[PDB]
Amino acid sequence: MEALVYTFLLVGTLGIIFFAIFFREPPRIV
Amino acid sequence: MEALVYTFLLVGTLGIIFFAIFFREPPRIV
Amino acid sequence: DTGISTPLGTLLKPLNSEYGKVAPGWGTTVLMGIFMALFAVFLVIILEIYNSSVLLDDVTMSWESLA
Amino acid sequence: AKPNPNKQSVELNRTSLYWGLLLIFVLAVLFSSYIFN
Amino acid sequence: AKPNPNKQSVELNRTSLYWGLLLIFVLAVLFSSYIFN
Amino acid sequence: XXXXXXXXXXXXXXXXXXXXXXXXXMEVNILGVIATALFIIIPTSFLLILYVKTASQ
Amino acid sequence: XXXXXXXXXXXXXXXXXXXXXXXXXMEVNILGVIATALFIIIPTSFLLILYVKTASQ
Amino acid sequence: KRGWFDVVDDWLRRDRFVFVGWSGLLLFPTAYLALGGWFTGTTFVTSWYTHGLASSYLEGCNFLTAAVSTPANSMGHSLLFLWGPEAQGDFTRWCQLGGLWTFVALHGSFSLIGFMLRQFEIARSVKIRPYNAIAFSAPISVFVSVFLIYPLGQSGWFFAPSFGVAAIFRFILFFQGFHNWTLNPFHMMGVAGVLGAALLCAIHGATVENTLFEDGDGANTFRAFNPTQAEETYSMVTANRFWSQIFGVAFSNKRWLHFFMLFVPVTGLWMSAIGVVGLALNLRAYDFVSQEIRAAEDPEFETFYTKNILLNEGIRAWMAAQDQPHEKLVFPEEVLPRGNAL
Amino acid sequence: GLPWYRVHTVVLNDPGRLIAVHLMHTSLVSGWAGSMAFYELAVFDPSDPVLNPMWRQGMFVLPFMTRLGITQSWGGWTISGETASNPGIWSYEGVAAAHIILSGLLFAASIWHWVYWDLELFRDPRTSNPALDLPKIFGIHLFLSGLLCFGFGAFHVTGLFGPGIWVSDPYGITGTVQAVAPSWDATGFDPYNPGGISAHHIAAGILGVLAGLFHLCVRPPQRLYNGLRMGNIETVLSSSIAAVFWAAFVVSGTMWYGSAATPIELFGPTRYQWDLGFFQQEIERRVQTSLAEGKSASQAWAEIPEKLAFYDYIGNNPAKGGLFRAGAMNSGDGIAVGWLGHAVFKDKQGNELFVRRMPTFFETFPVVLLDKDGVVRADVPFRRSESKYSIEQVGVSVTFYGGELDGVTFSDPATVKKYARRAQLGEIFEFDRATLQSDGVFRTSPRGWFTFAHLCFALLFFFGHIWHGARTIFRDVFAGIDADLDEQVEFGAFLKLGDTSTRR
Amino acid sequence: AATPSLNNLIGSVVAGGLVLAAIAGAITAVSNFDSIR
Amino acid sequence: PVDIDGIREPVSGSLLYGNNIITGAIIPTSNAIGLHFYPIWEAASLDE
Amino acid sequence: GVAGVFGGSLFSAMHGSLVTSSLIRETTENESANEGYKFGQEEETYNIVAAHGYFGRLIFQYASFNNSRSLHFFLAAWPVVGIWFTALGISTMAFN
Amino acid sequence: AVNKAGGVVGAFTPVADQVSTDSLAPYSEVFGLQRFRECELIHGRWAMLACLGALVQEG
């Protein structure tokens, strides 16, 4: 069961990375 | 463990009742 | 605007009245410095006793003093 | 592109929160004994 | 009446959400092995 | 001789107490704790997200 | 039949398998599942409550 | 007509070449003695009677192997004053007893307080924010936990890190062998802080240098700048677009970037300090019990963690005899864990 | 929008809701104490006070109730093992219920003091703005501290009106709750003298009252008021955080080193008792005296209390655990069942060998047997190819005196090795590893856990002193620095830093 | 009943005061000798 | 598991084989290989 | 290499703390100081002269970079040069 | 944006020896001659009873 937790944690972190790159707030000039 | 989870569920439900009565949204005329 | 008045509030109101009042100048600062110096020496002495850097004849500073 | 014209905003008043919180806890109280079994 | 004059509104922009979510998950990744032991 | 019978000789109970005076440690799936936890936090968070958004207008 | 009960165990193994050669690891706290779940959801919900409140204004 | 405090304050906070301030009354005396104690100890003072080692230039050591070594373990946590019951006023015997270590450690710890008070003192005078002092709490936490808290939880000052290059290396290798300090999740957060801060220092320095505006006709771009210039020296927009298309994410706020450059390193050292506090009590993340149970039951299950566990056993056994002479460990060679050949 | 790390700053200048917010933490802390006690009482086993004490079961708040005088339960049992005699209200269950009831009352008061925040009490009579006269408030709340400190040492600890405190013999064999008398001489500052506790809380209480009277009458100096920002409540937070981490360091030191306020019968032995051979020396002394009375070694060792021998086991050392080896010490090496008796190792020629005990620093330690003068005579070789000390070729035998295996002697090398490995851990005990499925790795006592927690809190709270302390002093520049500052910051523009009236 | 270790502790306290007095004395002297305005 | 030292003693480095995140690793190539190029097509089977 | 990362960590903390300490007041206390900076600003968000004045008094006047361009080159060079040598160190120790 | 600490708003000499209806703090100032005389008399009258009381019960 620990293997389930470890894999979910890792793919969960990569999910956040994907969203942070593409679903980010665009930096708009002033 | 079960006895701890049963008590938290019960007192948790009682805690909601307290807030629903005293910390309720006040009914205001118009 | 005066706030809610309560019987306990009026009773305790004098204790919260002199908000900004201060003694002019340095006041009792030198007297305070004396007590801090005495307190610093007291802290050192009890530290040395526990650290065993001061050996007193009566104190043993071990579990055996529980006897 | 142009913004989507179907945009809406979800709402949940406090009384709905209490009903929702009550249902979740009451349903948990009901099914907890069976889930533990 | 007399509403409290010290009212403030908490704010959390999206970049703070990503930093917060990364922190919570990366901390769990780091510490999960030890909690499971 | 061998201390294999020493622990057996401890007929007098020596163990941390169970929750009952008549002992309560029964075979319940510990997945019930997680299932109850997830069923509570996940919908509770969903409701709190919607209410705090609404309360802030 | 206890002879045949232990005959199968010493012979071809029992069912339900295990990840790889062996991954039972019953020593694993198992309470770590609740600790990991609670440490994820509770702060995540806190952050999501604030963001949705912020994003809506 | 001004009082003593005002006339003295005028002199202490005079804008001279080296600012003294009120905190300089605590910093400069203690800092000079801590520096002097270390230089004196590494040059003339021996560790022959405390560790059975030579640790001075006079004894033949070089900069790498000279150190100001800790007192013997029999001293416990004695503060070891020059006038204490150990080495009662005898200066040369005080040096032979390792009393110079506590001298450097104590006057050194008050110098860190004095320097942090100096940062507060100057920042208030210059009328700026006190974030440099807050940043300096992280090195103080490291010094306090490593040089004070850790030995206080152990048998005595003997196990504190001795003030030297190779002495720190022994302290480092001691922590691997005895505490498995690499496996600790708090050194891991400390490593990420230090490595992350080194990354930020390099990546930010290079980004600024390569997004500089053309404010001159010379190839030497260093001269085309004025500290009082109102315009920015580098294009944040170009920098932001560069890292957005290279890394996927980039800073858009200059203030946030510099705070992050401060948060990463400080948080890292602070997290690492917590772990050493745990090692003070031998409350260490030494092993994963689940794998140890599995490894003991299954003599074919091997991981890099179990390989490290055997390495620590080698470190402890082959190092204890000389690193801990007070234990008087006479290990015959047959009992030392040794692999095939080698 | 307000950042998430400044949300609780809304009660910074709201005295009514500051009390309400401080009433909520108070409600939670007492709520935790009641909840924690009830849990511990549901898991604690009081059947075996000698081989299964509180500190072996991971009990954290149970020792603190016992330290001040709570010894009986509504279940009818006493912590000493005797039968309860009308426990009364103040039992383990009663104290747990009281902290719980108090938690509810503080919760209710928090709601009231939050809704009714606009009280005329918190209004400055001169300006009509919310303000707190912190110099006077400190005198009030310090006088109560001095009064309560005095009463605790004069009535509760002293025994005039109260139970006293837990006092133990030096070796933690016989300890009870006793009324201690203040010791006013230098021995009052002995950390291991329980009489110093009553004397301190009396004398500090008297000085606390008098200081409260002074700080209630004399206004602060103007110079000190501005220097310390006494009009700003964040100054009080900085100094309180400083004082609380000072106390955390002290309270961690006396827990780790031991004192009259941390009896080993409640919190377990200290790591220094094992290092210095505190219990082993006492055990050998008692055996040696019995041998002086012409008693047999078999019967002299039988006289040794099993409680005393259990302290001489490295598994009860608080410096042998792990950060993530969670649970009770029973979960690590099992539940102690009985003493196996002292194991004396003998050479083939009859010379007695002693197993080198494992130092606390070693996770694993080679087993080596020494003779009287400290020379290595036998050991378990790692390299069993050209060994010169293996117990097989030295003929080492082990005989047990006292305990379960009294009289029994083993000569086969396999069992002699097995008990040699057990002998380096101190005294040899039989453990039950089946009830809780103990892993086999040691764990820390409540002494170790308390020290680690309050040391980590102490270190984190130092940053609190610096941050909240820098906030109050540098409050005028919290949102940023002034626009035009270059003229003042110039080097050599003025003789004195900052002072614009000292132009060069 | 003052042990020699106790005497040195008292002597250290006095010596510490002399060091502080020497520091304060030197600072006050220079501050007065070299004064602003 | 991978026989890293070339001594036919495989070392487990995968999550599904009993490791956690800290102890999991991709084990280096076998010592028998050395510096020799070992693409998947130079192996008889993907198991090898 | 250790001086590269310890120094780089030191310089990152110092540069970050010095710039943060010198932020020009552009917000209130109920808002993040970050809000005082607008992405695309043509003006400086902190006072370099003030930061140099602080660090100048902290050690001595000429131990501080008055030049932002020189300062940022130093922030880049020190860790990069340090990591170059420790990378060479492992490479040299590859050949024993 | 800026929260400056308070400065001296004036120097005042409060009138002492003024009793008010405040039960907890009746006098206007702690350091008053008439308040101290009441303290001197109350402390003194208690001591007179105590000095006689200590002697009589001992005898």
Ligand code: CLA
């Ligand atoms: C501000 C500068 C400063 C500071 C903070 C320190 C601090 C320290 N020194 Mg150091 N030292 C200094 C300057 C300083 N020193 C200088 C200029 C020299 C000469 C080069 C030395 C030479 C020196 C030596 C040789 C040693 C120390 C040692 C120590 C440590 C313990 C000694 C101690 O404080 O015991 C005493 C505690 C006090 C004096 C508390 C002072 C409180 C005030 C002054 C009390 C006022 C006294 C007054 C008469 C009132 C009477 C009260 C009544 C009850 C008696 C300590 C951390 C020892 C050490 O290193 O440990 C290993 C040691 O051996 N120092």
Ligand code: CLA
């Ligand atoms: C009538 C009130 C009351 C009483 C009788 C008790 C009684 C008890 N409490 Mg409880 N508690 C109370 C209120 C009370 N509590 C409230 C209001 C709270 C909420 C904050 C708590 C929260 C609480 C917790 C979390 C715990 C207890 C615990 C306990 C038990 C052990 C106490 C102990 O030994 O710790 C020792 C107490 C101290 C060491 C206090 C130290 C005082 C510090 C050092 C002050 C020093 C600074 C001071 C200001 C100096 C200036 C003054 C000086 C100059 C004179 C004990 C039976 C413990 C327990 O056993 O769990 C059930 C436990 O952990 N209580």
Ligand code: CLA
């Ligand atoms: C100073 C506070 C304090 C201290 C000293 C202790 C001490 C103790 N507690 Mg305890 N407890 C506390 C507060 C404290 N508690 C609080 C606030 C609660 C309410 C949650 C509890 C609830 C509690 C329970 C239910 C139990 C104990 C038990 C115990 C005993 C076993 C210790 C243990 O194994 O912990 C282990 C600690 C760790 C394994 C890790 C420490 C925390 C790390 C270092 C912080 C890292 C950050 C975080 C974990 C990251 C999360 C990542 C995510 C994946 C989870 C021990 C004597 C146990 C016991 O023995 O029963 C009698 C028991 O079952 N406590």
Ligand SMILES: CCCCCCCCCCCCCCCC(=O)OC[C@H](CO[C@@H]1O[C@H](CS(=O)(=O)O)[C@@H](O)[C@H](O)[C@H]1O)OC(=O)CCCCCCCCCCCCCCC
């Ligand atoms: C225990 C927790 C579970 C861990 C799971 C880890 C993996 C996922 C981590 C996600 C964390 C990020 C959350 C915040 C994202 C955000 O703000 O988005 C920004 C956009 C902005 O809104 C949109 O924005 C668009 C443009 S912009 O983005 O505003 O520029 C606009 O056009 C549109 O109208 C508007 O709606 O939000 C969205 O609409 C995104 C979709 C909603 C979020 C869904 C996330 C969950 C996906 C499922 C993952 C689990 C199963 C996966 C199976 C393949």
Ligand SMILES: CCCCCCCCCCCCCCCC(=O)OC[C@H](CO[C@@H]1O[C@H](CS(=O)(=O)O)[C@@H](O)[C@H](O)[C@H]1O)OC(=O)CCCCCCCCCCCCCCC
């Ligand atoms: C019963 C004891 C606790 C049991 C806890 C059990 C958990 C489940 C129940 C609680 C969770 C559900 C409540 C939701 C609240 C809501 O929607 O209204 C929001 C309320 C309404 O008041 C606000 O007050 C406003 C006034 S002002 O603006 O704040 O001045 C006013 O406009 C109006 O009333 C309202 O908006 O806002 C609050 O101020 C409430 C505080 C936040 C909620 C606290 C939850 C935790 C309670 C304690 C938990 C620990 C228990 C142990 C105690 C020792």
Ligand SMILES: CCCCCCCCCCCCCCCC(=O)OC[C@H](COP(=O)(O)OC[C@@H](O)CO)OC(=O)CCCCCCCCCCCCCCC
């Ligand atoms: C083309 C190939 C792409 C290469 C891969 C690049 C990976 C991208 C990773 C970024 C995701 C992190 C999001 C940060 C959250 C975020 O998106 O914030 C966005 C943030 C933008 O901040 P602003 O300048 O807009 O701040 C304005 C204020 O509102 C701040 O609150 O960017 C940064 O902070 C720079 C730091 C980036 C460096 C990230 C650290 C490294 C990532 C660590 C990953 C952990 C390992 C996981 C393994 C399982």
Ligand SMILES: CC1=C(/C=C/C(C)=C/C=C/C(C)=C/C=C/C=C(C)/C=C/C=C(C)/C=C/C2=C(C)CCCC2(C)C)C(C)(C)CCC1
């Ligand atoms: C209202 C009322 C009532 C009731 C009450 C109650 C019921 C109370 C209780 C309450 C409670 C029942 C409380 C509890 C609480 C708890 C707590 C508060 C805890 C928390 C925890 C923490 C905080 C921790 C953290 C951490 C972890 C998790 C990990 C490690 C680290 C640490 C430890 C830090 C009555 C009847 C009286 C009547 C009157 C009214």
Ligand SMILES: [Fe+2]
């Ligand atoms: Fe920069």
